[PDB]
Design an enzyme around this catalytic site. Structure first.
Site, PDB file in Angstrom:
ATOM      1  N   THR B 165       0.849  -1.187   0.000  1.00 48.77           N
ATOM      2  CA  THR B 165       0.000   0.000   0.000  1.00 48.77           C
ATOM      3  C   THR B 165       0.893   1.247   0.000  1.00 48.77           C
ATOM      4  O   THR B 165       1.950   1.239   0.622  1.00 48.77           O
ATOM      5  CB  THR B 165      -1.004  -0.015   1.196  1.00 48.77           C
ATOM      6  OG1 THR B 165      -1.520   1.302   1.434  1.00 48.77           O
ATOM      7  CG2 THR B 165      -0.347  -0.522   2.455  1.00 48.77           C
ATOM      8  N   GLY B 198      -8.574   0.218  -3.340  1.00 45.56           N
ATOM      9  CA  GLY B 198      -7.372   0.090  -4.155  1.00 45.56           C
ATOM     10  C   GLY B 198      -7.536  -0.891  -5.298  1.00 45.56           C
ATOM     11  O   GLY B 198      -8.459  -1.717  -5.303  1.00 45.56           O
ATOM     12  N   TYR B 200      -8.332  -0.189  -8.354  1.00 49.42           N
ATOM     13  CA  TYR B 200      -9.190   0.409  -9.375  1.00 49.42           C
ATOM     14  C   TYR B 200      -9.951  -0.661 -10.170  1.00 49.42           C
ATOM     15  O   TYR B 200     -10.672  -1.473  -9.584  1.00 49.42           O
ATOM     16  CB  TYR B 200      -8.373   1.342 -10.292  1.00 49.42           C
ATOM     17  CG  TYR B 200      -7.853   2.575  -9.585  1.00 49.42           C
ATOM     18  CD1 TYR B 200      -6.704   2.517  -8.782  1.00 49.42           C
ATOM     19  CD2 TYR B 200      -8.517   3.796  -9.697  1.00 49.42           C
ATOM     20  CE1 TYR B 200      -6.223   3.653  -8.122  1.00 49.42           C
ATOM     21  CE2 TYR B 200      -8.047   4.937  -9.041  1.00 49.42           C
ATOM     22  CZ  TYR B 200      -6.901   4.856  -8.252  1.00 49.42           C
ATOM     23  OH  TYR B 200      -6.433   5.980  -7.600  1.00 49.42           O
ATOM     24  N   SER B 209      -4.474  -1.532   2.374  1.00 48.04           N
ATOM     25  CA  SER B 209      -4.670  -0.649   3.518  1.00 48.04           C
ATOM     26  C   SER B 209      -5.722  -1.187   4.482  1.00 48.04           C
ATOM     27  O   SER B 209      -5.627  -0.942   5.686  1.00 48.04           O
ATOM     28  CB  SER B 209      -4.984   0.793   3.079  1.00 48.04           C
ATOM     29  OG  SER B 209      -6.270   0.907   2.490  1.00 48.04           O
ATOM     30  N   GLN B 245     -18.838   7.029  -3.734  1.00 44.45           N
ATOM     31  CA  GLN B 245     -18.590   7.967  -2.632  1.00 44.45           C
ATOM     32  C   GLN B 245     -19.256   9.336  -2.842  1.00 44.45           C
ATOM     33  O   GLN B 245     -19.391  10.106  -1.886  1.00 44.45           O
ATOM     34  CB  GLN B 245     -17.083   8.114  -2.330  1.00 44.45           C
ATOM     35  CG  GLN B 245     -16.298   8.978  -3.319  1.00 44.45           C
ATOM     36  CD  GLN B 245     -14.932   9.410  -2.793  1.00 44.45           C
ATOM     37  OE1 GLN B 245     -13.900   8.974  -3.302  1.00 44.45           O
ATOM     38  NE2 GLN B 245     -14.922  10.281  -1.783  1.00 44.45           N
ATOM     39  N   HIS B 270     -10.219  11.054  -5.130  1.00 41.70           N
ATOM     40  CA  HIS B 270      -9.535  12.345  -4.974  1.00 41.70           C
ATOM     41  C   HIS B 270     -10.090  13.448  -5.877  1.00 41.70           C
ATOM     42  O   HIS B 270      -9.417  14.441  -6.130  1.00 41.70           O
ATOM     43  CB  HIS B 270      -8.013  12.220  -5.141  1.00 41.70           C
ATOM     44  CG  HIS B 270      -7.441  10.979  -4.541  1.00 41.70           C
ATOM     45  ND1 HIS B 270      -7.657  10.620  -3.229  1.00 41.70           N
ATOM     46  CD2 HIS B 270      -6.654  10.012  -5.072  1.00 41.70           C
ATOM     47  CE1 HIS B 270      -7.028   9.487  -2.977  1.00 41.70           C
ATOM     48  NE2 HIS B 270      -6.416   9.096  -4.079  1.00 41.70           N
ATOM     49  N   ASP B 296      -4.455  12.764   0.338  1.00 40.01           N
ATOM     50  CA  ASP B 296      -4.156  13.196  -1.026  1.00 40.01           C
ATOM     51  C   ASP B 296      -4.849  14.480  -1.442  1.00 40.01           C
ATOM     52  O   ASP B 296      -5.423  14.561  -2.535  1.00 40.01           O
ATOM     53  CB  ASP B 296      -4.424  12.067  -2.027  1.00 40.01           C
ATOM     54  CG  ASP B 296      -3.337  11.017  -2.017  1.00 40.01           C
ATOM     55  OD1 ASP B 296      -2.147  11.379  -1.879  1.00 40.01           O
ATOM     56  OD2 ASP B 296      -3.663   9.828  -2.166  1.00 40.01           O
TER      57      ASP B 296
HETATM   58  N1  SAH Z   1     -16.699   7.500  -6.870  1.00 42.90           N
HETATM   59  C1  SAH Z   1     -16.021   6.554  -6.163  1.00 42.90           C
HETATM   60  N2  SAH Z   1     -16.546   5.952  -5.062  1.00 42.90           N
HETATM   61  C2  SAH Z   1     -15.867   5.013  -4.367  1.00 42.90           C
HETATM   62  N3  SAH Z   1     -14.628   4.601  -4.692  1.00 42.90           N
HETATM   63  C3  SAH Z   1     -13.986   5.124  -5.764  1.00 42.90           C
HETATM   64  C4  SAH Z   1     -14.664   6.148  -6.574  1.00 42.90           C
HETATM   65  N4  SAH Z   1     -13.822   6.490  -7.556  1.00 42.90           N
HETATM   66  C5  SAH Z   1     -12.698   5.758  -7.401  1.00 42.90           C
HETATM   67  N5  SAH Z   1     -12.796   4.942  -6.329  1.00 42.90           N
HETATM   68  C6  SAH Z   1     -11.763   3.994  -5.850  1.00 42.90           C
HETATM   69  O1  SAH Z   1     -10.803   4.641  -5.006  1.00 42.90           O
HETATM   70  C7  SAH Z   1      -9.599   3.852  -5.023  1.00 42.90           C
HETATM   71  C8  SAH Z   1      -8.371   4.749  -4.947  1.00 42.90           C
HETATM   72  S1  SAH Z   1      -6.915   3.830  -4.551  1.00 42.90           S
HETATM   73  C9  SAH Z   1      -7.173   3.414  -2.842  1.00 42.90           C
HETATM   74  C10 SAH Z   1      -5.851   2.886  -2.269  1.00 42.90           C
HETATM   75  C11 SAH Z   1      -5.957   2.151  -0.927  1.00 42.90           C
HETATM   76  N6  SAH Z   1      -6.683   2.972   0.085  1.00 42.90           N
HETATM   77  C12 SAH Z   1      -4.570   1.845  -0.410  1.00 42.90           C
HETATM   78  O2  SAH Z   1      -4.035   2.561   0.438  1.00 42.90           O
HETATM   79  O3  SAH Z   1      -3.927   0.880  -0.832  1.00 42.90           O
HETATM   80  C13 SAH Z   1      -9.651   2.976  -6.270  1.00 42.90           C
HETATM   81  O4  SAH Z   1      -9.709   1.591  -5.891  1.00 42.90           O
HETATM   82  C14 SAH Z   1     -10.932   3.402  -6.975  1.00 42.90           C
HETATM   83  O5  SAH Z   1     -11.611   2.301  -7.590  1.00 42.90           O
HETATM   84 MG    MG Z   2      -3.173   7.465  -0.998  1.00 44.70          MG
END
Ligand code: SAH
Ligand code: MG
Ligand code: SAH
Ligand code: SAH
Ligand code: MG
Ligand code: MG
Lengths: 363, 387, 393, 354
Positions: B165, B198, B200, B209, B245, B270, B296
């Site tokens: 992560t 995570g 994607y 994480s 989200q 983000h 981020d």
């Molecule tokens: N609208 C949305 N609602 C929920 N999740 C989303 C989103 N858009 C993107 N994401 C998700 O947010 C993630 C960002 S990466 C997350 C990384 C993880 N927390 C770690 O630390 O390893 C991706 O898996 C992506 O699919």
């Molecule tokens: Mg991050």
């Protein structure tokens, strides 16, 4: 290659304030101090976990000078300095010399940011894309290993026991959580630690595992190891071995005067009952007030081949008879200077200090 | 596998006193509880360092019953259960069921001895060559298994490397801040929601994480939200949820279903609008004394994420939100106004912690009272009143 | 008075060392003078006594063949003070080795539940007819008096809220609730020989009041040196480990001068005028003088909403307020994430802030190297591209 | 006044998550809980320091309900509930009921803000007549609030201060403080009941039990039960231990027997708990034997001899001046294996590789 008195002085000044750090960097050559800190760092680094080998550049800066060390980081090899041409540089880590002195050897609060600078893939075009996928994870893991060695985070004694092939925990014994409880509050002190019994016995190569454990546990400490056999090969930064007999009271008093006084003394030597008793009488006076005397492996108190007696009531000459008399003392030098006894399976901790508190008129 | 309601009940009861531990073992089949604890132990163990594979027999005892599990321990492989004959048994480790419950899921002080029993080379008949081959390996294997039978705080930075992560080591340096803000929650039965599992759109990647929070919080339930299906990540004490989200209605549904949360972390898309939508919808479902974390914030400056290159043009950014929280903390200091009335966030923020690319928001009753009327509202008058 | 500031700091520095430094100390300085210094520190360190009946606690400080005897009169509602040996009933004898008392007060040491001192109850009581009645009279008072003196002979962490009510400062209890935040942020520094500068000594124009917060930090930081800055004279507040400085917090050249003289500082606290311009001037002038890993503290940002302190009623018009400053510090923390610009150069604050903590009426700024590196160019700068680059196909 | 079983249930539930806190407040009358929490607060409050008498209003809110308690806070007097017209209200403190439960009896991290609301001089109106009271009630209302808020939390107290307040301790602190967030059961043998109040104060989630031959029912209060009986009757000791235990901590004052109570009560100490012996030649003998008990797995094998209960159940001994702490746990680490040599020279040879 580093003078012991010098190392001790560097550690002493590092624990001070801004004036002491400045005094430190004017008293000694900065290049020399940088080399000393890298040597310390390389001993502190945990084992690397990255499959693909990477370089971590460690830049130490003092005023106008920049001392650069390129560290090779791969699983199953200890981190060592190599030339810049010998691999891919995944990360540049920059420290101010005085900041690194503080982080390694200082008396400091925990600092979750702002102790250094970092620049990822610093010298990275054509392969630009391909290089990322090959070294990204390996650089993350390599950097984490190096940064772990650049601070003073408390390690796990049980894990160090497996790592340094010492039997303090995991098969024969289960001492380390007791050691952690009794030792961890001493970690910001410039301790002097003496262990009787370096290990390996008469074999020319084995031994020193527990010394390396104490060095790792006490970031500001000096570790001494006494053994009847020559253990010169174990010696390294902050670890000195001394050749002699724990059963020679005169000799112990001599090395205690030269190297003491000790915050901690550990008996993991011959395990002969008379030896344990001789060493205690000779060395307990040289333990600092608030310090500890540790005895390991009281199991030999029950065995005639180590000068013990199978009958637990026949304890007059055994290590357990000593511990029993320490109980009387708590309620001669020893009597006046013991305030605590901690007994666990095959290990006992003796607390040194005037036993003089709470006095009442006897009438 | 193991029912979520049951796992949480086990953890609830394991955190009590003797009567609760007895209630636990009488309410559930002891054999089932043992399998649950072993599943937990498997995820909890650190990577082994022994080159030669060994077995560590874990024997879990309750009443007249004895549940035997043989764990294969070797470097570069995950610790796994095997049959009794599938290796050399270097160590027998024995726990009373109620003791293992305390050690794994209990509210407990540190116990340096007396939590179990150990028998080295339990089946070796006196054996010589076996010492040379296995002593060290047995010692190192036992050490790894025993670490997994307890609740010792791990190193978040190390877990970041182990679980792949980006929280620490290359792009980011979050873990020491997380450690400081999170470590005092470790004996609580926390509910943790992370937005962004995570991986994607990749079919296998993600969840690093979540596995990290599970290790750090020995009594916790972890939830992960992601727009993509992440069902493959789900394990004991880890549930993934599929959703958006930016969908306030959906967030509230899942918050009612699984909350309230002690900790919420936004590590999602983000997109600035998403960060703001999630905060507004989920902050009311953070427990008093809880934390809302945003990772981020760098995307605040980037149009492709809804940000603005000019840091002053922050009205729609995550940094604009953070800046407004400062005012929210100070809201009781505003001059009197019968028209204006404090919003939910105003009344409910008691701290803000901002570090590079990570911010922590403290939930709590913000009701200390503003500066009273009788204290003068200009410098000179204050000087004459305090003399 | 007798204890030169450079001497006190040297004593504190050496006390923090190992055996060779404690020996160096007692050889560098007269043991009698050191013993007098330690007692002066102890009197300031002791909590309020609770005993109704006045007792004497004898503190004997032993060094070699020398025995420095101090008879401390201890009673509820009076400051503990040295008296003559005959001026009370001696409830308790307390005995320290000089070097041991040095470690306990000014050293860096682990908790030592026992073995630091000797004690003897009723040390001079003669076996008489009056003795029985004398024990009834003094037993409770002796233990309570001894408790108060022993607390002053150590470095046990005090309750900040208690020190607030003890030294009469508004940090906690009525107007403010700062102390638990100060405790959270300050307690890890207690091992260190800290230099703490607080702007605003207290009392204002009044020739007697003030110093409450300075005494609070002296008690909280056993090894520290405290500096207090005030526009007014505060010379009367000065005591062991506390120095006051007269000057304007809005004079940058003066601030740079005193910081160069007495710094660098582990901790700077702004509790001065609360004028918005003053907070901004002080921060820019003093932040460069906070040690890496140190803290800059701003109190009472409530005046940011009030024109009488140069504030603004509308929270949105914050460009010149302390809150405007705190808001800009978030951008400062984030500065490496800005799109690249050849003409733009990161400022000192940008490069040197690594954390911001905002609570009601108090904020803590973490000084440190802000050089983690921003998100690399090769990470996509829009969400859709990020998804594609992170999904591996 | 309050049922013991109920108090213990409240404490058990308060140590849980949201669903336990809600279950608690729907299982019991909020008004009753409020009164229980106030009783607890009054026993936790430090002695007040303010010369001028002031009132602190503690308001406890739960849904539609609002429980208002006015507390007179004065130096040299214990804090007690009075009517609103029995003094000047210098501060209103407001808690959510569930929040107060957490703060007093919960398993919780330290929360430096946001656990309550506070309104200074909550009933002072006008301007011309207000100035007079501000000058006299300012300092007292600060010191009075401080004392009340101190009792509203679970902050660790100084045992040395407690030992004077209720008419040595650093060792107790060392060994006891890690237990403080557990719902401990503490048994003290030998009971004024000053020391029982000390342990009540020190263990915020604890139940305290005091055994004495005399009737001491006048010492009983919230979270303190006294038991009358003969501590030399081993059956009785076993009986009350099954009834009220098992105990995380047993404290045995030997000065005023020790071998008898230790043998009877040690089996009723929880694994990971403590048996404490204070003070005398018969005490010392026991302590010394406990070293052999710890080491018992190192004895040469004997078919005729088998380890006793204590042998199998002691894992640590800590001896100080006039007090010893015995650690209860499974003593089953294993003795040194047969294949390790039993004389020095053979051991040297066997571990020297050549
Ligand atoms: N609208 C949305 N609602 C929920 N999740 C989303 C989103 N858009 C993107 N994401 C998700 O947010 C993630 C960002 S990466 C997350 C990384 C993880 N927390 C770690 O630390 O390893 C991706 O898996 C992506 O699919
Ligand atoms: Mg991050
Ligand atoms: N009389 C004596 N004086 C000093 N050392 C002795 C001795 N008799 C034996 N020794 C040494 O004591 C050691 C015991 S083994 C020590 C193990 C080591 N501390 C570890 O943990 O790894 C052996 O190396 C042996 O050489
Ligand atoms: N321009 C200026 N420079 C320096 N000090 C100033 C100032 N204006 C006001 N002050 C001082 O700042 C103080 C504010 S009150 C400080 C309270 C104190 N820190 C405590 O907590 O107890 C007053 O004593 C006042 O004299
Ligand atoms: Mg050994
Ligand atoms: Mg103020």
């Amino acid at each position: 290659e580093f003078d012991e008195a010098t190392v001790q002085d560097v550690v002493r000044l590092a624990g001070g304030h801004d004036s002491e750090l400045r005094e430190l960097t004017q008293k000694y050559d900065p290049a020399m101090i940088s080399r000393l800190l890298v040597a310390e760092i390389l001993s502190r680094c945990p084992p690397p976990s990255n499959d693909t080998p990477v370089l971590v550049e460690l830049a130490i800066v003092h005023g106008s000078e920049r001392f650069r060390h390129f560290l090779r980081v791969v699983r199953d090899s200890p981190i060592r300095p190599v030339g810049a041409d010998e691999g891919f540089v995944g990360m540049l880590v920059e420290y101010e010399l005085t900041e690194l002195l503080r982080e390694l050897f200082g008396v400091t609060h925990e600092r979750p940011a702002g102790v250094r600078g970092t620049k990822l893939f610093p010298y990275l075009d054509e392969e630009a894309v391909e290089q990322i996928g090959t070294y990204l994870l390996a650089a993350q893991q390599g950097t984490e290993a190096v940064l772990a060695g650049c601070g003073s985070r408390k390690p796990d004694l049980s894990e160090l026991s497996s790592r340094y092939f010492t039997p303090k925990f995991g098969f024969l014994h289960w001492f380390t959580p007791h050691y952690d409880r009794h030792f961890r509050d001493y970690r910001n002190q410039q301790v002097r630690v003496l262990e009787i019994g370096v290990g390996g016995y008469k074999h020319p190569e084995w031994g020193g595992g527990s010394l390396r454990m104490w060095k790792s546990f006490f970031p500001r400490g000096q570790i001494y190891g006494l053994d009847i056999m020559d253990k010169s090969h174990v010696d390294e930064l902050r670890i000195r071995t001394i050749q002699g007999d724990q059963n020679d009271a005169e000799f112990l008093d001599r090395i205690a005067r030269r190297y003491g006084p000790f915050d901690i003394v550990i008996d993991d030597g011959s395990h002969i009952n008379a030896h344990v008793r001789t060493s205690f009488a000779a060395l307990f006076p040289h333990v600092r007030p608030g310090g500890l005397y540790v005895i390991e492996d009281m199991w030999t108190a029950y065995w005639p081949g180590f000068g013990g007696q199978a009958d637990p009531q026949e304890c007059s000459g055994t290590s357990l008879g000593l511990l029993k008399s320490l109980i009387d003392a708590i309620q001669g030098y020893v009597d006046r200077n013991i305030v605590g006894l901690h007994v666990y399976h095959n290990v006992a901790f003796v607390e040194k200090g005037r036993n003089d508190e709470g006095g009442i008129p006897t009438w």
